Amino acid sequence: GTVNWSVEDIVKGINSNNLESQLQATQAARKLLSREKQPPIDNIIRAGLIPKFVSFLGKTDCSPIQFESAWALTNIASGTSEQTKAVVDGGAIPAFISLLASPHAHISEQAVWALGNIAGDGSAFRDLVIKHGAIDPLLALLAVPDLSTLACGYLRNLTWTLSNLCRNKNPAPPLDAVEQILPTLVRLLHHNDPEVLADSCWAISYLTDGPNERIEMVVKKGVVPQLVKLLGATELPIVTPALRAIGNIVTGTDEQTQKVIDAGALAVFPSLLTNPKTNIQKEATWTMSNITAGRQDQIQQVVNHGLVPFLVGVLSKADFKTQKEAAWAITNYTSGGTVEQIVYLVHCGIIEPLMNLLSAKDTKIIQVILDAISNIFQAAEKLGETEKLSIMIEECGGLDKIEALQRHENESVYKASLNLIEKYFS
């Protein structure tokens, strides 16, 4: 029975000169820290136990106390930034990195987990873990011919810790560290375990959330086709990070965007744009908006895949945030599209849901919609059809909205609505 000791008992045992009494009290500490009702992390920290646990990490001749203190320190490090800091301040980083070499899989796994909590605190501790040299021993834990021979929970913990080394910005992780880690991430992106795949996708989405040189580091490894495949997965915990990574990638150059189109991503968007999860619809529409901001032949691929009716559908009925992203998709489309493409977009029914959205209480979406309207009117002048479109906007209640928006707080709103009223409704 090491169940339900007091912190004072734990301190008394850890302070004895008896390694076995210390092992008993460390296991008591661990069981205290792995109950879910409010683990007394701060009392353990305050008792001054962290340096003792960290020294127990180096008792290679008593592997049980290595394990129990590794687990206790893991759970302290799982807490607030101050609690993680207390663990780091006890010298835990190099001791856990040494434990990565342990012959006992449960102990090296626990060192992997602890290092993942430390790195997961943020940029500074992530970079400190990297500077102490964790990446090579971590990656060496995966240097086997076939990932499937590793224990499931083990491989999952390693994948999660690696993704935490890829995570966070300001600054993003060191370029050389990202380059060291990426080949292993690519291998994990082809593993068959859903949880490994989800965490690998999260890591790729972190690496692609930056400037185009970061995106390019990833796209150059040729993972986009695999990301599109995962974009078609049935498991939502996979589709969410695959979609986020794909959308990050299309915020880059038109050639990076083109790699996404080339890999076949557009064929998944009918189901993504009607997906029952609001966040999937929102992120798919955001991705579409950064694709309609591309070249006219890319706008044309959007058209050929039949996606303009889906954008019309999401503009007509969706969560308001999704509708804002659809408004952006439409304004980008109209800004870059040919006149034929803008005409197509009107023929699909864009005007009425665009009008209906002008009555929303969000300034930016109203600016976005008015900009799209102006672009469509300019395509109409190019065809001498401005009267027809004026009639359409008047026929669905739009004119009332633009006129009422003449008297609006925002400067751009009233300026643009007044411009439209004078240029086309007079």
């Binding site: 820290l33 792995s34 893991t74 626990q110 987990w113 909590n117 997961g120 605190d121 995570r167």
Partner: peptide, 7 residues
């Protein structure tokens, strides 16, 4: 998800 307690 960024930090994980065991058990």
């Amino acid at each position: 998800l960024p930090k994980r307690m065991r058990r």
